[PDB]
Design a protein around this ligand. Structure first.
Ligand code: MH0
Ligand SMILES: O=[N+]([O-])c1ccc(O)cc1
Length: 137
């Protein structure tokens, strides 16, 4: 289920994190207006770029913490607040987050592995709800 999936992703997180983020950028190429320095690069070229690997892993490190702290795929309001208040998130709207979770669930459904994709869809929806409640446009 969802808690086991957190353990699965954590056991190979740099790889999963880069593969899901690449799935997101390829499904939604207009999302690169928040990643100017990732324009005009193939997947293998991005996985050679220091900030790509390090920023994407740090993102998924904290995503796994928020998922781990959730009850029944509902995040803590302290975590949603952190994600809204972060200077790094100044530009963003809830639809940026919805698109990331769409890509993440599609990734999971394509894997041969027994991911609980319905739980990840609920999590993404619940995080979007929480971000809206914590003041994200
Ligand atoms: C597509 C929009 C977008 C979404 C969705 C998004 C979703 C998430 N984020 Fe977060 N984040 C986005 C846009 C950014 C930007 C633009 C930056 C700045 C750093 C950069 O460009 O590498 C950033 N996020 C930076 C970060 C950083 C700091 C990275 C670093 O500087 O090394 C963390 C920890 C982070 N986020 C957390 C999270 C978490 C957790 C989620 C999932 C709930
Ligand atoms: O997965 N994400 O949403 C990310 C990935 C990398 C990054 O630099 C910022 C956000």
């Amino acid at each position: 289920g969802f808690k086991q999936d957190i353990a699965t992703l954590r056991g190979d997180l740099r790889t999963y994190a880069q593969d899901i983020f690449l799935a997101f950028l390829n499904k939604y190429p207009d999302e690169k207006r928040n990643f100017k320095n990732y324009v005009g690069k193939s997947d293998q070229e991005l996985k050679s770029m220091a900030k790509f690997g390090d920023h994407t892993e740090k993102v998924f490190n904290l995503m796994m913490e928020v998922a781990d702290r959730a009850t029944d795929c509902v995040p803590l309001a302290s975590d949603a607040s952190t994600l809204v208040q972060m200077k790094q998130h100044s530009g963003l709207t809830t639809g940026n987050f919805e698109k990331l979770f769409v890509a993440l669930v599609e990734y999971m459904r394509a894997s041969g592995q027994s991911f609980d994709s319905q739980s990840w869809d609920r999590f993404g929806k619940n995080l979007v709800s929480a971000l809206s409640s914590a003041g994200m446009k």
